[PDB]
Design brief:
Subcellular location (chain D): Golgi apparatus; Cytoplasmic vesicle, Clathrin-coated vesicle membrane
Structural class of chain F: alpha+beta
Helix content of chain F: 40-55%
Family (chain D): Belongs to the adaptor complexes medium subunit family.
Shape of chain F: globular
Shape of chain C: elongated
Structural class of chain C: mainly alpha
Number of strands of chain C: 0
Radius of gyration of chain F: 15 Å
Radius of gyration of chain C: 34 Å
Strand content of chain F: 15-25%
Largest sheet of chain F: 3 strands, antiparallel
Oligomer: part of a larger assembly
Distance between the termini of chain C: 43 Å
GO cellular component, one term (chain D): synapse
Protein name (chain D): AP-1 complex subunit mu-1
InterPro entries (chain D): Adaptor_comp_med_subunit (IPR050431), AP2_Mu_C_sf (IPR036168), AP_mu_sigma_su (IPR022775), Clathrin_mu (IPR001392), Clathrin_mu_CS (IPR018240), Longin-like_dom_sf (IPR011012), MHD (IPR028565)
Chains: A little secondary structure (10), B mainly alpha (585), C mainly alpha (570), D alpha+beta (415), E little secondary structure (18), F alpha+beta (142)
Number of strands of chain F: 7
Largest interface: C-D, 92 and 84 residues
Helix content of chain C: 55-70%
Chain lengths: 10, 585, 570, 415, 18, 142
C-alpha cells in the first residue's frame, strides 16, 4: 500500500 | 445527492482510463441534471463532486453559473463551496469572475469574520486587473482595522492589488504608516512583506520607508533575543518566516546608501555569528543574511564573515546546502569577485557532481567567474566539460563558451580556434541564433582570414549535417573565397583548394536532403557571390543556378530565378553589386 | 524462504518437489532473480514426471547465460533424454538443447542432433530442423563442420509436409545470414515438389513454403505461368499473411511474365479482390495492408485503379489507419473520383485531430497539384475552409494556397481579393510567410498591398529569418511593380534590413537589393520580377531500383517503413 | 522473426515473457512503456514500436498489450498473425482475457507458449488439436499435427451427426452527411458448428453467380460475391478448378467461408434526422426512421444510436415507438427498439438543455449508428444449394443452417 | 426456437445439375 | 511568492493543486505534466531543487506522495522547505495521523487549511497554533 503511512510519522 | 466519499470510492474503484472517464461522465450527467433544476439543498455535494472531477482532469465549464449562485448564498457551507470553486475553476481569463465583484463587495462588509476573510482570500488568489480597480476602496478600509486575524488578510489583499495594479500603490501609503509595532507575528510579517513589495515596486517610497530602519533593526534584535516561544519556534528558531522577511528587507534596504547599511551592520554582525545553522531553518537564515550583506554596502568584516560562511557551506555534503551556496556565489559574482577565485577548485569539482541542479549551478558559477586572466586556463576545462556534458547541457555549455570568447577572448586567433572547436564538437547542440553572432564576429575581424578559411574548408569537407557549422562554413567561404584559394584561375600545383571542390561541396549541400532551407540559402548566396570573387570556375555555377531556379521552395525558386537572370542578362553588372558588406558591432 | 525452498527442492518427496518447482517458476515470473538456486535445481533434473521436467528445462534455458559454468551439469541429462521413446520428451529435449545459450555446451550436442535428424517422428523431425538452425545461428562454423546442410537439403525432399516446411524455413534462415555462398537454391523440380506440399502445409507452414519462391527467379514464361497458376489458389486463404505472401509472390513473378499474354490481365483482375478482402482485416493489420498497397501502388497502379470506395476513412478507424487512408487516396487520386476525393477531404476537415487536419490539408493540396482538372474545386474548398475560421485550418489553407499559386498562378487572380482580408493576424511562420509570398508575387489584384505590408513591417527585424526574407522580397517586388506607392517603403525596408538587420543571408540579400535599386531600377523588372520556369514538384514515386528491391521484401519491417533492409537493421 | 514474445500489463508489468531466439535482452521491455507513452502523447503511437535496433511490434488485448521483441527484419505480418493465433488460443483455453488468469494459469500458459513457437517460427496453432497434448488438469502428440489433416482429429465418435450453420450477414453502410451512401458493402459470414462422427469431407454447394454461369444456370438469383475467403480445411485447388467447395469440417464451431461483395440496393433502414440546436439555448432532434426492408422480416433489437450533445442535460424525448434512453457514459441518445416490423416508420422529437457558457474545445460530430439485427433475412439472396457430407463408414447426416441479418458498419454521417 | 432466424436443414448437392 | 503548489503522488496522481498564477487550463495541465515528469525522473540526491522555466521548483516529499512548489528567483530556498514542513506539521496536527487515504477524502479540508495559511503565494500566519485555532473555529461555525 504505502498510503496509510503518515506523511511525517510524528 | 451522492457524498464526496462515495464519489471518491467510486472513482478509485475504476481501473481503466476509459472506465474512469465513463464513471466521471456518468457522475457529471447527474451533476448537470441537478444543476439545471436550480437545486439548493444538496448543492454542496454537487459542487464538491464537480471540483473533484475538474481536478481529476475533466471539464467543468457548465459548473460556472452554479458557483456564482452559491457565492451569493447565505449558508456558510454553501459560501465556502462557492469561494473554493471561484478560487479553483475561476481565473482572470475565465471572463465569468466579473459578476463576482458584486458578491465580493456584499461579502466584504459581512459581520462574520470567516465570510469576509474567505472573500478576501479568494480576491487575493484570483485578483483581476478590473476587480482590483473596483475593489481598491474596500480593501483600504479593512487595512486600517485593528482585527489581528483580518490585518494579515488586508495586507495580503493590498499586496495582491499592488502586484496586479502597480499604479494603485499611491493609495496604500497613508494606510500602512505606523504599523511596525504589531505584537502578533503574523501581522508584523504581513506588514514587512507589504513594505518590501512597496519598496520593490517603486523607489519613491524607499525614502519614506527608509526612516523605519531603526525600528526594523530593533524588532529583529528583540526577535533574536526571544529565541524561545511555543508559537513560531520550530527547530530552535523563533519566527523563521519573520526573520527571513526581516533579512530580506534589510538586504533590499540601504543597498546604495551608507546610513541604511551602517544602521543594520550591528544586527547583521550579531546574526552572522549568533545563529545556529545545524537545522535547515538556520542554514536558510544564514543564506538570507549573506545575500543581504552582499546586496548592501556593509563593512569589510561582514563581507569576510559572509565569504567564510559561504566557503564553509560549500563543503557541506547536503545537496540543498550546496545549491544554496552555489546560488549565493553566483549572486555575489560581481560583488567581491576577487574573493570568489579562492573556490575555483570547488567550482571545478561541482561540475562532476551527480546533481543536475548542482551541476547547473557550478556551470553558471564557472561561466560568471571567467576573467581576463583565467580565460585561457578555463578554456580547457570548459571544453572538457562540454565534451563530457549531458545532452541538455551541451548547448548551454557551448553558448556559455561562445559568450565568454566573445566577451573576454584573449586573442582573435585563440578565440577563432575555440569557436571552430566548439562548432566542430557542438554538432547539433549549437543554437542557430549563434550563427549570426559568429558571422558578425568573422566579418568584424579582417586580419585572420586565410587560416580561418582553410580551417572552415577542412571542417566542411568531412561533415555537412551540422546546420550551424555548415552555415558558418558557407558564410566564411562566401566572404573569403578570394583568400581560401590564391592564384587558382587555371590548373596549378596540387594544393588543398583547387577551385572545384568548393563548388561541388556547395552543390552537394544545396541538393543534400539534410538541408532546412537556411543552409541551402547560404550555400546559394555563396555560390552567387563566388561568380565575382572567383574567376577560375566561371560559367559553371550559371547552369546550376538555372537548374536550381525551378526548386520547390518559393523563396529558393525566386533566388534561383534571380541568380539565373543576373547571370544571363547582367553579366557585366554582376560584379557591380558583389561588394563586401559593411562590418559593424 | 530461500533456505526453505532449497530444503524443499533437496527432498525426496515428489509432492514437495512439484510445489517447489512451481514456486521457483512463479518467483522468476514474479520478477525474482532465482539464478542463485540454479545449481540446487540441477540435482532435481532427471524426473519421471513430465510436468516438472518442462519447468526445469524452462528455468535452465532462462538461467543458462547467467550461470554458464553451472550449466555444465546438464549434458548427460540432455543426452539421456534425447533417446526417450516418447516423441514429446525428445522434442522438448531438442528444443531445450538449442535454447541453451552455452558455447561449451553446443559442442557436445552435435551427436544428439545428428541422431535426431533422421527421426521418424514428424514432431521429432521438426524439432531437429529447428535445433539445427538454432545451432547454425549460434555457431555457423560448428553447424558447417557437422555437415547438417546435406541433411537439411534432403529434409525438403521427404514426407511429413510440416517437417518439410520447417526444414525449408530453417534453410532460409541459415541462407539469410549466409553470405550467399553455396546457396540452397533448387531447380524447377524442387519448386514443383514444394508446390505439391504447399497445399498440404498448415497456416504457419504456408508462409514458409511461399517464402522459398520469393528468392527464386523464373527464367521462362511457362514456368512463371505455372507458378502463377499454382499460387492463384492461395488468394482464398483465411490467413491475412498467407494472402499477403501470395500477393508478394505473384508480384515478384510478374517481373518475368509477359503482359501480352492473358495471364497478366487475369492476375491483375484476381489481385484486386484480394486487396479488398485484406482491407477488411484487424486495425493492427490495417497499417500493414496500407503499407503493402502503397508499395505495390507505385509498381502496378493499373490494378487498384477503380478501388476508391474502400479507401474511405471510417469514423472508428485508428489514427495510424486514418493517416494511411489519406496517403492511399492521394496515391489513387484521379479525375474519375476527384469529386469523391474532395468530398472525403471536406468531411475530414471537420474532425478534431490537429495532426489529422494537417494531413488532410496536405492530401488536398497534393491532389490539387497532381490533377489540374480539379484546381477550381480545390481552390473553392480552400476558400471555404479559410472562411471556416479555424486557426490550424487557416494555416493549412494558407500553405495550400501558397503552394498552388507557385504551381498554377495563371488563373489564381480571382482569390487574391478574398485572401486580402482573411485574418492576417495569424503568427504561424509557415502561414505568414506563405501569405507574404502570395501578396508579393500576386501584387496586382490587390490595391492595398502596400497597406497590408505595413503591418508586417513593424517587427520584421525580429519576426524570423524566412519571414523577414519573404517580406523583403515582397517589398522589392511591390517597389519594382509599383514604385509610386512604395518609394519610401523600399527605402525603409533597405534601412531596416541593411542597418538594423544582423542576419548574414538577410543582410546580403538586403545589400544586393539596395545595389540593384541604386544601379538600374529598370533592369530590376527583368531581373527580379522575371518569369520563373515551371516548378518541378517533388515526385512521391520511389526509385525503380528501390521498388524492385522492395518488391522482394514484402511483409517485412523494410516494407512497412519503406526503407531498405540494410538501412534499418543493426 | 520475433526475438521474444512477452505479455505486459496495464501498469507496465510484464505478466509473462518467453524468449524464442534470445537476440534481444530482456531489459529492453522497460523502455517499451515510456516509448508507448511518448508515442501516444505525441500522436506517434503505433502497433509497431522501435527501441533503437529492436522493434516492439504488438497489439493491445483486453487487458494487456502482447509486445513481441524483434531485432532483424522479421515479417511484421507473421508476428501479427502469431499474436492473433495466440490470442485465439488463450480465449479458447481461458474463457476470459484478463490478468486474473495470467497469474493463475502459468503452468499451462508456459507449456503452450513453448510448444506454439520455437525459434520464432510457430508450428502448431489449432486450439482443438493443441488441447490433446497440453492440459492444465503428457501422452504422445496426436497424429493430426504430423498428418496433412491438422483440422480434423480422427477417432471422433458422436451419437448423432448434426451440423449447425450460421449465415450471418453484416450490413455496413457509410452514409455521408449530405444524404448519400459512400461505403455500402455486405460481408457474408458462414460459421458452422460441425458435430458428427469421424472425419467427413463436406462438399459445399451454394447459388453462386459464377457457379450458375459455369453450369449454365446464370438466370436465377445468384450471389455475386466479390471476395470469398475459404477456411484452412477448404481446398484452394478445388475452388480454383471448378468452384468445388470440398473440405473436411472440424469438431466444433469454425468459420468455413467469408463472402464479401458490394451492395447496390436501398438501405434496410432510412433515418431522417434534424438538429434544431439553439445557440446555447436548446436543441431539437427531429429524427424519423423509415424501414426500407421487407415487411415480412422483423429487426429484433433495433438500436439506432443518436449522438446527443456532450454537455446536454435535462433531456426530454418525444418519440413514437421504442425505448429512448440517453447514456451519459456514451453521450448519445440510444433509440432502442425491441421489435421493428419491416416498413415501420418511427418519428422522434428530442429536446435537451445546454449550458449558457460555451465549451472550451470542440467535441466533433459522432456519426449515427443503427444496431438493427433482423433474423431470417438474406439481403444478398444467396441460398445454400447442397452440402455433400461423405464418410467412409457411411451415415445419414442432419445438417442445419440459419440466416441472420444484422447491421455492420451501418453508420450515418452527421451534419 | 432461436433468435436471429430458426435453423433450416441443408441439402446434399445440386440434384438438378446431375 | 509561491507561483504554484501541487501535491502529487508517487504514481503520478495529484492529490492537491494550488497555483497563484493565472494560466490557461491546457497550459496549466501541460505545466503540471512537465513538473511531474521532471520530479518523477529525478533521483534521491538531486538536492530537491529544480530550476524549471526560471522557477525555483523545490521538491520535498515526506511519504509516497511528493510535494512541489514554484518560487521565483528572489527569495531564499530553505524558506520554502521550512514553510512546507510547517504546513505538513499543521495539517498533521489538524487531521491527526494524516495519511494518503485521508487526503483524497478530506481534500476540501486541506484546501481550506492552505487558503487560511498561505494566500496569493505568500504566507498569512507564521505561527502554527493560531492558524489551527482559526481553522477549528471556522469549521465549528457550521
Amino acid at each position: 500500500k504505502g498510503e496509510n503511512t503518515s506523511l511525517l510519522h510524528p | 445527492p451522492i457524498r464526496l466519499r462515495e464519489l471518491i470510492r467510486t472513482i478509485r474503484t475504476a481501473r481503466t482510463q476509459a472506465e474512469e472517464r465513463e464513471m466521471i461522465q456518468k457522475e457529471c450527467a447527474a451533476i448537470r441534471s441537478s444543476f439545471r433544476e436550480e437545486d439548493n439543498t444538496y448543492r454542496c455535494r454537487n459542487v464538491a463532486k464537480l471540483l473533484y472531477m475538474h481536478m481529476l482532469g475533466y471539464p467543468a465549464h457548465f459548473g460556472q453559473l452554479e458557483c456564482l449562485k452559491l457565492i451569493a448564498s447565505q449558508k456558510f457551507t454553501d459560501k465556502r463551496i462557492g469561494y473554493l470553486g471561484a478560487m479553483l475553476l475561476l481565473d482572470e481569463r475565465q471572463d465569468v469572475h466579473l459578476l463576482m465583484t458584486n458578491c465580493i463587495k456584499n461579502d466584504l462588509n459581512h459581520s462574520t469574520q470567516f465570510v469576509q476573510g474567505l472573500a478576501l482570500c479568494t480576491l487575493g488568489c484570483m485578483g483581476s486587473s478590473e476587480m482590483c480597480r473596483d475593489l481598491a476602496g474596500e480593501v483600504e478600509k479593512l487595512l486600517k482595522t485593528s482585527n489581528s486575524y483580518l490585518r494579515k488578510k488586508a495586507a495580503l489583499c493590498a499586496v495582491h492589488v499592488i502586484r496586479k495594479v502597480p499604479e494603485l500603490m499611491e493609495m496604500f501609503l497613508p494606510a500602512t504608516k505606523n504599523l511596525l509595532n504589531e505584537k502578533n507575528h503574523g501581522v508584523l510579517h504581513t506588514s514587512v512583506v507589504l513594505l518590501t513589495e512597496m519598496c520593490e515596486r517603486s523607489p519613491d517610497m524607499l525614502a519614506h520607508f527608509r526612516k523605519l530602519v531603526p525600528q526594523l533593526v530593533r524588532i529583529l534584535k528583540n526577535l533574536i533575543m526571544s529565541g524561545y516561544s511555543p508559537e513560531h519556534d520550530v527547530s530552535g528558531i523563533s519566527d523563521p518566516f519573520l526573520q527571513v522577511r526581516i533579512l530580506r528587507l534589510l538586504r533590499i534596504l540601504g543597498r546604495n546608501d551608507d546610513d541604511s547599511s551602517e544602521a543594520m551592520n550591528d544586527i547583521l554582525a550579531q546574526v552572522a555569528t549568533n545563529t545556529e545553522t545545524s537545522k535547515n531553518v538556520g542554514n536558510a537564515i544564514l543564506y538570507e543574511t549573506v545575500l543581504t550583506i552582499m546586496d548592501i554596502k556593509s563593512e569589510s568584516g561582514l563581507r569576510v564573515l559572509a565569504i567564510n560562511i559561504l566557503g564553509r557551506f560549500l563543503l557541506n555534503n547536503d545537496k540543498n546546502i550546496r545549491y544554496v551556496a552555489l546560488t549565493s556565489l553566483l549572486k555575489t559574482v560581481q560583488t567581491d569577485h576577487n574573493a570568489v577565485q579562492r573556490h575555483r577548485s570547488t567550482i571545478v569539482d561541482c561540475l562532476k557532481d551527480l546533481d543536475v541542479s548542482i551541476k547547473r549551478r557550478a556551470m553558471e558559477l564557472s561561466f560568471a567567474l571567467v576573467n581576463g586572466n583565467n580565460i585561457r586556463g578555463m578554456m580547457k576545462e570548459l571544453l572538457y566539460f562540454l565534451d563530457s556534458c549531458e545532452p541538455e547541457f551541451k548547448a548551454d555549455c557551448a553558448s556559455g563558451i561562445f559568450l565568454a570568447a566573445e566577451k573576454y577572448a584573449p586573442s582573435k586567433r585563440w578565440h577563432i580556434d575555440t569557436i571552430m572547436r566548439v562548432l566542430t564538437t557542438a554538432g547539433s547542440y549549437v543554437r542557430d541564433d549563434a550563427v549570426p553572432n559568429l558571422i558578425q564576429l568573422i566579418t568584424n575581424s579582417v586580419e585572420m582570414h586565410a587560416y580561418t578559411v582553410q580551417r572552415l574548408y577542412k571542417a566542411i569537407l568531412g561533415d555537412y549535417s551540422q546546420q550551424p557549422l555548415v552555415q558558418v562554413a558557407a558564410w566564411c567561404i562566401g566572404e573569403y573565397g578570394d583568400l581560401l584559394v590564391s592564384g587558382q584561375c587555371e590548373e596549378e600545383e596540387p594544393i588543398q583548394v583547387t577551385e572545384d571542390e568548393v563548388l561541388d561541396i556547395l552543390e552537394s549541400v544545396l541538393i543534400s536532403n539534410m538541408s532546412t532551407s537556411v543552409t541551402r540559402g547560404y550555400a546559394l548566396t555563396a555560390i552567387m557571390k563566388l561568380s565575382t570573387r572567383f574567376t577560375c570556375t566561371v560559367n559553371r555555377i550559371k547552369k546550376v543556378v538555372s537548374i536550381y531556379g525551378s526548386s520547390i521552395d518559393v523563396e529558393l525558386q525566386q533566388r534561383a530565378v534571380e541568380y539565373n537572370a543576373l547571370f544571363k542578362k547582367y553579366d557585366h553588372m554582376r560584379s557591380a553589386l558583389l561588394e563586401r558588406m559593411p562590418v559593424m558591432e | 524462504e530461500i533456505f526453505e525452498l532449497k530444503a524443499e527442492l533437496n527432498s525426496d518427496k515428489k509432492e514437495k518437489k512439484k510445489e517447489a518447482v512451481k514456486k521457483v517458476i512463479a518467483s522468476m515470473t514474479v520478477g525474482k532473480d532465482v539464478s542463485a538456486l540454479f545449481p540446487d535445481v540441477v540435482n532435481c533434473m532427471q524426473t519421471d514426471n513430465l510436468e516438472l521436467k518442462k519447468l526445469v528445462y524452462l528455468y535452465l534455458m532462462n538461467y543458462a547465460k547467467s550461470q554458464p559454468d553451472m550449466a555444465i551439469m546438464a549434458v548427460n541429462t540432455f543426452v539421456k533424454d534425447c533417446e526417450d521413446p516418447n516423441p514429446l520428451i525428445r522434442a522438448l529435449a531438442v528444443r531445450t538443447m538449442g535454447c541453451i545459450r552455452v558455447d561449451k555446451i553446443t559442442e557436445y550436442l552435435c551427436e544428439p542432433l545428428r541422431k535426431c535428424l533422421k527421426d521418424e517422428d514428424p514432431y521429432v523431425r521438426k524439432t531437429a530442423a529447428v535445433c539445427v538452425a538454432k545451432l547454425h545461428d549460434i555457431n555457423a562454423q560448428l553447424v558447417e563442420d557437422q555437415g547438417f546442410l546435406d541433411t537439411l537439403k534432403d529434409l525438403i525432399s521427404d514426407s511429413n509436409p510440416m517437417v518439410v516446411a520447417n526444414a525449408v524455413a530453417a534453410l532460409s534462415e541459415i541462407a539469410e545470414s549466409h553470405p550467399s555462398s553455396n546457396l540452397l537454391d533448387l531447380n524447377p523440380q524442387s519448386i514443383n515438389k514444394l508446390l505439391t506440399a504447399l497445399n498440404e502445409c498448415t497456416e504457419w507452414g504456408q508462409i514458409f513454403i511461399l517464402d522459398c519462391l520469393a528468392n527464386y527467379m523464373p527464367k521462362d514464361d511457362r514456368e512463371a505461368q505455372s507458378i502463377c497458376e499454382r499460387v492463384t489458389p492461395r488468394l482464398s486463404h483465411a490467413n491475412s499473411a498467407v494472402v499477403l505472401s501470395a500477393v508478394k509472390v505473384l508480384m515478384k513473378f510478374m517481373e518475368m511474365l509477359s503482359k501480352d499474354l492473358d495471364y497478366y490481365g487475369t492476375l491483375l483482375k484476381k489481385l484486386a479482390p484480394p486487396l479488398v478482402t485484406l482491407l477488411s482485416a484487424e486495425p493492427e493489420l490495417q497499417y500493414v495492408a496500407l503499407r503493402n498497397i502503397n508499395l505495390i501502388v507505385q509498381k502496378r497502379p493499373e490494378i487498384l485503379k477503380h478501388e476508391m470506395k474502400v479507401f474511405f476513412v471510417k469514423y472508428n478507424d485508428p489514427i495510424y489507419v486514418k493517416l494511411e487512408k489519406l496517403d492511399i487516396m492521394i496515391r489513387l487520386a484521379s479525375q474519375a473520383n476527384i469529386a469523391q476525393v474532395l468530398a472525403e477531404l471536406r468531411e475530414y476537415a471537420t474532425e478534431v485531430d490537429v495532426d489529422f487536419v494537417r494531413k488532410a490539408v496536405r492530401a488536398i493540396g497534393r491532389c490539387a497539384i497532381k490533377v489540374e482538372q480539379s484546381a477550381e474545386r480545390c481552390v473553392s474548398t480552400l476558400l471555404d475552409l479559410i472562411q471556416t475560421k479555424v486557426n490550424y485550418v487557416v494555416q493549412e489553407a494558407i500553405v495550400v494556397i501558397k503552394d498552388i499559386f507557385r504551381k498554377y498562378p495563371n488563373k489564381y487572380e480571382s482569390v487574391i481579393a478574398t485572401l486580402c482580408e482573411n485574418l492576417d493576424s495569424l503568427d504561424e511562420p509557415e502561414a505568414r510567410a506563405a501569405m507574404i509570398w502570395i501578396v508579393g508575387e500576386y501584387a496586382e489584384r490587390i490595391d492595398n498591398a502596400d497597406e497590408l505590408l505595413e503591418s508586417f513591417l513593424e517587427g520584421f527585424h525580429d519576426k524570423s529569418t524566412q519571414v523577414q526574407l519573404q517580406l523583403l522580397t515582397a517589398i522589392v517586388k511591390l517597389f519594382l511593380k509599383k514604385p509610386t506607392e512604395t518609394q519610401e517603403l523600399v527605402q525603409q525596408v533597405l534601412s531596416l534590413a541593411t542597418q538594423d538587420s544582423d542576419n548574414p543571408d538577410l543582410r546580403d540579400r538586403g545589400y544586393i537589393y539596395w545595389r540593384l535599386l541604386s544601379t538600374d531600377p529598370v533592369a530590376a523588372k527583368e531581373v527580379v520580377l522575371a518569369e520563373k520556369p515551371l516548378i518541378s514538384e517533388e515526385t512521391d514515386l520511389i526509385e525503380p531500383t528501390l521498388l524492385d528491391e522492395l518488391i522482394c521484401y514484402i511483409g517485412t519491417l523494410a516494407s512497412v517503413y519503406h526503407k531498405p533492409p540494410s538501412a534499418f537493421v543493426e | 522473426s520475433a526475438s521474444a514474445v512477452y505479455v505486459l500489463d496495464l501498469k507496465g508489468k510484464v505478466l509473462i515473457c518467453r524468449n524464442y531466439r534470445g537476440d534481444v535482452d530482456m531489459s529492453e521491455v522497460e523502455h517499451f512503456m515510456p516509448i508507448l507513452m511518448e508515442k501516444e502523447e505525441e500522436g506517434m503511437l503505433s502497433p509497431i514500436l522501435a527501441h533503437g535496433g529492436v522493434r516492439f511490434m504488438w497489439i493491445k488485448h483486453n487487458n494487456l498489450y502482447l509486445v513481441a521483441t524483434s531485432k532483424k527484419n522479421a515479417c511484421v505480418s507473421l508476428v501479427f498473425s502469431f499474436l492473433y493465433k495466440v490470442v485465439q488460443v488463450f480465449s479458447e483455453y481461458f474463457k476470459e482475457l484478463e490478468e486474473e488468469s495470467i497469474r493463475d494459469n502459468f503452468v499451462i500458459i508456459y507449456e503452450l507458449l513453448d510448444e506454439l513457437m520455437d525459434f520464432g517460427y510457430p508450428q502448431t496453432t489449432d486450439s482443438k488439436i493443441l488441447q490433446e497434448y497440453i492440459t492444465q488438469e503428457a501422452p504422445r502428440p496426436p497424429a493430426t499435427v504430423t498428418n496433412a489433416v491438422s483440422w480434423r482429429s480422427e477417432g471422433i465418435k458422436y451419437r448423432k451427426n448434426e451440423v449447425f450453420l450460421d449465415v450471418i450477414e453484416a450490413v455496413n453502410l457509410l452514409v455521408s452527411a449530405n444524404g448519400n451512401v459512400l461505403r455500402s458493402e455486405i460481408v457474408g459470414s458462414i460459421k458452422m458448428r460441425v458435430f458428427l462422427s469421424g472425419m467427413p469431407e463436406l462438399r459445399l454447394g451454394l447459388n453462386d453467380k459464377v457457379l450458375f454461369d459455369n453450369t449454365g444456370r446464370g438466370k436465377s438469383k445468384s450471389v455475386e460475391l466479390e471476395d470469398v475467403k475459404f477456411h484452412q480445411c477448404v481446398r484452394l485447388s478445388r475452388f480454383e478448378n471448378d468452384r468445388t467447395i470440398s473440405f473436411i469440417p472440424p469438431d466444433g464451431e469454425f468459420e468455413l467461408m467469408s463472402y464479401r461483395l458490394n451492395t447496390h440496393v436501398k438501405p434496410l433502414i432510412w433515418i431522417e434526422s434534424v438538429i434544431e440546436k439553439h445557440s446555447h439555448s436548446r436543441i431539437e432532434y427531429m429524427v424519423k426512421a423509415k424501414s426500407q426492408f421487407k415487411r415480412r422480416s422483423t429487426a429484433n433489437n433495433v438500436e439506432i444510436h443518436i449522438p446527443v450533445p456532450n454537455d446536454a442535460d435535462s433531456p426530454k424525448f418525444k418519440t413514437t415507438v421504442g425505448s429512448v434512453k440517453w447514456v451519459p457514459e456514451n453521450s448519445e441518445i440510444v433509440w432502442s427498439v425491441k421489435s421493428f416490423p419491416g416498413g415501420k416508420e418511427y418519428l422522434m422529437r428530442a429536446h435537451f438543455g445546454l449550458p449558457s457558457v460555451e465549451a472550451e474545445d470542440k467535441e466533433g460530430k459522432p456519426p449515427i449508428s443503427v444496431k438493427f439485427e433482423i433474423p431470417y433475412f438474406t439481403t444478398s439472396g444467396i441460398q445454400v444449394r447442397y452440402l455433400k457430407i461423405i464418410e467412409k463408414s457411411g451415415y445419414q447426416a442432419l445438417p442445419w443452417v440459419r440466416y441472420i441479418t444484422q447491421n455492420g458498419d451501418y453508420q450515418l454521417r452527421t451534419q | 426456437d432461436r433468435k436471429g432466424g430458426s435453423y433450416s436443414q441443408a441439402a446434399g448437392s445440386d440434384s438438378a445439375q446431375s | 511568492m509561491i507561483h504554484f503548489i501541487l501535491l502529487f503522488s508517487r504514481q503520478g496522481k495529484l492529490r492537491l493543486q494550488k497555483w497563484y498564477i493565472t494560466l490557461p487550463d491546457k497550459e496549466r495541465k501541460k505545466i503540471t505534466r512537465e513538473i511531474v515528469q521532471i520530479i518523477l525522473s529525478r533521483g534521491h540526491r538531486t538536492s530537491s531543487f529544480v530550476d524549471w522555466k526560471e522557477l525555483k521548483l523545490v521538491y520535498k516529499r515526506y511519504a509516497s506522495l511528493y510535494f512541489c512548489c514554484a518560487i521565483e528567483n528572489q527569495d531564499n530556498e530553505l524558506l520554502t522547505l521550512e514553510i512546507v514542513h510547517r504546513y505538513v506539521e499543521l495539517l498533521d496536527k489538524y487531521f491527526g495521523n494524516v495519511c494518503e487515504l485521508d487526503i483524497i477524502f478530506n481534500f476540501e479540508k486541506a484546501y481550506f487549511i492552505l487558503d487560511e495559511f498561505i494566500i496569493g503565494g505568500e504566507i498569512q500566519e507564521t505561527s502554527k497554533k493560531i492558524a489551527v485555532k482559526a481553522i477549528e473555529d471556522s469549521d465549528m461555525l457550521q
